[PDB]
Amino acid sequence: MLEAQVQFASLWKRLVECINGLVNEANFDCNPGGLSVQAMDSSHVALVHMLLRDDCFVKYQCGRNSILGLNLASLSKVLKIVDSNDSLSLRHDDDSDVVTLTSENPEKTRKCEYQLKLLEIEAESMGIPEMDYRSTVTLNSAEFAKIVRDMQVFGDTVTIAISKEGVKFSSSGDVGQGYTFLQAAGVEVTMEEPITLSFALRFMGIFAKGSTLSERVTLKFAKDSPCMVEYGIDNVGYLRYYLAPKVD
Amino acid sequence: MLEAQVQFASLWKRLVECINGLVNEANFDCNPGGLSVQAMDSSHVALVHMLLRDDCFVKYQCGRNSILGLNLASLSKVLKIVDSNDSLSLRHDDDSDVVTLTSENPEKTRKCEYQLKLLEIEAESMGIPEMDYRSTVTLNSAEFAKIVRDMQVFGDTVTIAISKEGVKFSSSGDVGQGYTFLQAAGVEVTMEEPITLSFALRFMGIFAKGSTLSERVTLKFAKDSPCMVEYGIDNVGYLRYYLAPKVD
Amino acid sequence: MLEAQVQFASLWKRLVECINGLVNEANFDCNPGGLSVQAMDSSHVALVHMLLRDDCFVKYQCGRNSILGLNLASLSKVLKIVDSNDSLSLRHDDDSDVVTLTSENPEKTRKCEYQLKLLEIEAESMGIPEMDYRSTVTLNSAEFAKIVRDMQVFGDTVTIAISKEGVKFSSSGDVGQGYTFLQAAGVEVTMEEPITLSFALRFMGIFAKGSTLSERVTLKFAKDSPCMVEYGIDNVGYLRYYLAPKVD
Numbered sequence: 001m002l003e004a005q006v007q008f009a010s011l012w013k014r015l016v017e018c019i020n021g022l023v024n025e026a027n028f029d030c031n032p033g034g035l036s037v038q039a040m041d042s043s044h045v046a047l048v049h050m051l052l053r054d055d056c057f058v059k060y061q062c063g064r065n066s067i068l069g070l071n072l073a074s075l076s077k078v079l080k081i082v083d084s085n086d087s088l089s090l091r092h093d094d095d096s097d098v099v100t101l102t103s104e105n106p107e108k109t110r111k112c113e114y115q116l117k118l119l120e121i122e123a124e125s126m127g128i129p130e131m132d133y134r135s136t137v138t139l140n141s142a143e144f145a146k147i148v149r150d151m152q153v154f155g156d157t158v159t160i161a162i163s164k165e166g167v168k169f170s171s172s173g174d175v176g177q178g179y180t181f182l183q184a185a186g187v188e189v190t191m192e193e194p195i196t197l198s199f200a201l202r203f204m205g206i207f208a209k210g211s212t213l214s215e216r217v218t219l220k221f222a223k224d225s226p227c228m229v230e231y232g233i234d235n236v237g238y239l240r241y242y243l244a245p246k247v248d
Numbered sequence: 249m250l251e252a253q254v255q256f257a258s259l260w261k262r263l264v265e266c267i268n269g270l271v272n273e274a275n276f277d278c279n280p281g282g283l284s285v286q287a288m289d290s291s292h293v294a295l296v297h298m299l300l301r302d303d304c305f306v307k308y309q310c311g312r313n314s315i316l317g318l319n320l321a322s323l324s325k326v327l328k329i330v331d332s333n334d335s336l337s338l339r340h341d342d343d344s345d346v347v348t349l350t351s352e353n354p355e356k357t358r359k360c361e362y363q364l365k366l367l368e369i370e371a372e373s374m375g376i377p378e379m380d381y382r383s384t385v386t387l388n389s390a391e392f393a394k395i396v397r398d399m400q401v402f403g404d405t406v407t408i409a410i411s412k413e414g415v416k417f418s419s420s421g422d423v424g425q426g427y428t429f430l431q432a433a434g435v436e437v438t439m440e441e442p443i444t445l446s447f448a449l450r451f452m453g454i455f456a457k458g459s460t461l462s463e464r465v466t467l468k469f470a471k472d473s474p475c476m477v478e479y480g481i482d483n484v485g486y487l488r489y490y491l492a493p494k495v496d
Numbered sequence: 497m498l499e500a501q502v503q504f505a506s507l508w509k510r511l512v513e514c515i516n517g518l519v520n521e522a523n524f525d526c527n528p529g530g531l532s533v534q535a536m537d538s539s540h541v542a543l544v545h546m547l548l549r550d551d552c553f554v555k556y557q558c559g560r561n562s563i564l565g566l567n568l569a570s571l572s573k574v575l576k577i578v579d580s581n582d583s584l585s586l587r588h589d590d591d592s593d594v595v596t597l598t599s600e601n602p603e604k605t606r607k608c609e610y611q612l613k614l615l616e617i618e619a620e621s622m623g624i625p626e627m628d629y630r631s632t633v634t635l636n637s638a639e640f641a642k643i644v645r646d647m648q649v650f651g652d653t654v655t656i657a658i659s660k661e662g663v664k665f666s667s668s669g670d671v672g673q674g675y676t677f678l679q680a681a682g683v684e685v686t687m688e689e690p691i692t693l694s695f696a697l698r699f700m701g702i703f704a705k706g707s708t709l710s711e712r713v714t715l716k717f718a719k720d721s722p723c724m725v726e727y728g729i730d731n732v733g734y735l736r737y738y739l740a741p742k743v744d
């Protein structure tokens with residue numbers, strides 16, 4: 001038996017949208033100590049790790065690890081119809097091919113239950129990059145999102161430059177060339193070396209949807225190494241993305 | 249001859265929008281009692297009956313029964329460009345071939361007038377499915393619309409089950425299966441007996457636009473009988489839908 | 497060689513949208529009196545003339561008249577991603593083959609800079625029409641914009657009839673006939689004679705977007721003559737459109 005109730009469905013809604021943007025199916029590693037989702041785009045260029053610790057749920061009951069694989073396409077379609085202010089309980093009875101989502105009015109006047117079928121999803125082949133990040137920049141989630149959208153009016157790749165002075169996002173295409181410089185503090189830059197890597201704006205966009213979860217976003221970079229985009233879900237979880245640098 | 253001035257065009261705007269979306273053309277039964285529209289889908293599964301009693305208009309003048317046929321498509325377009333807070337005088341003259349919608353601002357500083365050509369539409373073979381309903385449910389028009397839209401993510405058929413306890417809406421499909429139960433009281437139920445019938449969501453959605461006209465909606469049900477979705481237009485008229493169940 | 501900064505980019509964002517509506521490339525006559533675009537549509541029936549005077553900018557510098565060709569398409573695509581309340585400094589150095597738009601935060605914490613390639617625009621046949629205007633209707637900018645959107649539901653040609661009582665905009669088509677009458681007083685008419693011209697609505701629509709720059713619009717008319725449609729920019733310049741009568 002499994003049960004995770006959240007006070008506000010908004011979290012699940014704002015979460016699945018962030019993930020469905022990268023992959024359309026994923027396995028929910030529901031183990032005691034929290035609910036984890038790990039997955040890679042078909043390009044094998046970009047990975048999402050999502051942890052929700054057990055302190056995140058008003059009710060959480062996972063005695064033994066049970067992996068549940070799920071169609072994010074369907075799940076997303078169901079969550080769209082669930083009022084955010086309503087409660088949401090995700091429940092699985094052992095040896096079921098379906099998992100149950102239950103929502104209730106704060107008033108208890110209305111109850112909605114939605115049953116979705118489970119899938120068989122093979123375990124992610126690749127795993128979190130084992131890297132120590134030299135340069136770390138933190139900035140307002142929404143500003144990050146705007147910048148990617150903006151840089152995309154120019155090209156499909158963004159050249160991020162970390163410097164003591166601040167980060168410079170730059171891009172070029174037919175429309176022409178542009179850049180956005182963010183003066184460091186507010187932009188909290190931590191640097192050991194002046195690092196400057198380039199990344200695919202398509203994925204950066206997918207990531208930026210994290211603005212729905214956290215007011216600020218931590219971007220961690222390492223020379224000739226994947227990047228991490230971390231979104232903190234309060235101190236009750238996190239959403240982390242990893243993307244490959246563009247190389248010549 | 250005919251003259252039907254309403255103080256606020258909002259009504260006509262909302263009504264035509266509702267009636268359109270089941271039918272493209274309709275005859276306006278201009279009787280000295282009021283205006284009436286009776287019509288049926290191409291599928292001939294769904295009927296719409298609308299009554300606007302003379303009390304609804306600030307100036308009704310229909311000495312004799314005139315049947316005016318109109319393209320709801322063309323009417324909807326002309327109405328979309330009319331401020332709802334403006335007057336709307338519908339008018340026809342002997343053998344005019346055209347109807348005249350006239351609109352004025354409260355300040356009488358702006359006058360808009362539009363002329364639409366009448367169509368010849370044959371009378372409706374089917375008649376109001378006059379019947380007595382065992383069970384009668386009233387709820388918030390808006391919640392109804394939400395429920396129909398929500399159930400439409402699962403399937404195209406809705407199963408309504410009426411119990412002293414309350415009303416549950418069930419739908420199934422590839423996405424999976426979901427249900428929304430409403431606890432009886434503002435859910436006002438009224439069952440001389442328990443009943444559970446299934447309907448097409450497509451036509452339910454067409455009806456659910458009645459919310460723009462009324463904050464509550466009354467649903468009447470009889471076994472192996474068309475249902476009725478009623479929306480009261482103040483005390484000046486009503487909009488009624490009747491739809492054939494699905495039985496196996 | 498040229499620098500022109502404005503406090504709020506709102507103007508540029510609102511201006512380019514207006515003039516990108518009519519033409520995709522335009523030359524900017526930069527000179528010490530200010531910036532000036534004068535362009536015709538390809539059909540040669542419509543002419544836009546825009547003047548921003550030096551006092552429009554918080555900082556203007558143009559010793560020598562240079563002509564700059566810009567792709568209003570690209571310029572549009574850039575200004576879309578510039579915050580209204582950020583400042584915008586348009587600059588050009590001797591034989592640079594690009595202009596630089598530079599965007600500063602009020603708080604100076606963010607700097608965006610974009611470079612657009614300059615075009616060689618050959619069209620300069622534009623000759624401001626003589627202005628012996630007899631009639632001068634002036635009305636709310638957004639009402640004129642609505643009237644044209646509305647008249648488009650009927651036809652693609654509008655007939656403006658100016659009389660002592662007020663102005664009538666008439667249109668006809670498959671949907672039917674329509675007209676909006678605005679009585680004089682805030683409609684301010686000024687005629688020497690009853691005048692009635694007809695005009696293409698496609699262009700009147702392009703012009704109407706001027707409502708973003710001015711709370712009021714001025715239409716000037718003369719028999720057999722192009723009308724003028726003038727949007728005042730705050731006494732620091734203008735946006736004027738001229739359109740050939742369709743009575744030809």
Ligand SMILES: N=C(N)c1ccc(OCCCCCOc2ccc(C(=N)N)cc2)cc1
Binds near residue numbers: 621622744
């Ligand atoms: N460079 C010059 N000295 C010059 C050359 C031509 C010109 O033209 C005057 C009449 C026509 C241009 C005034 O605006 C239009 C445009 C198109 C039509 C049409 N084709 N219906 C009607 C009126 C004015 C000045």
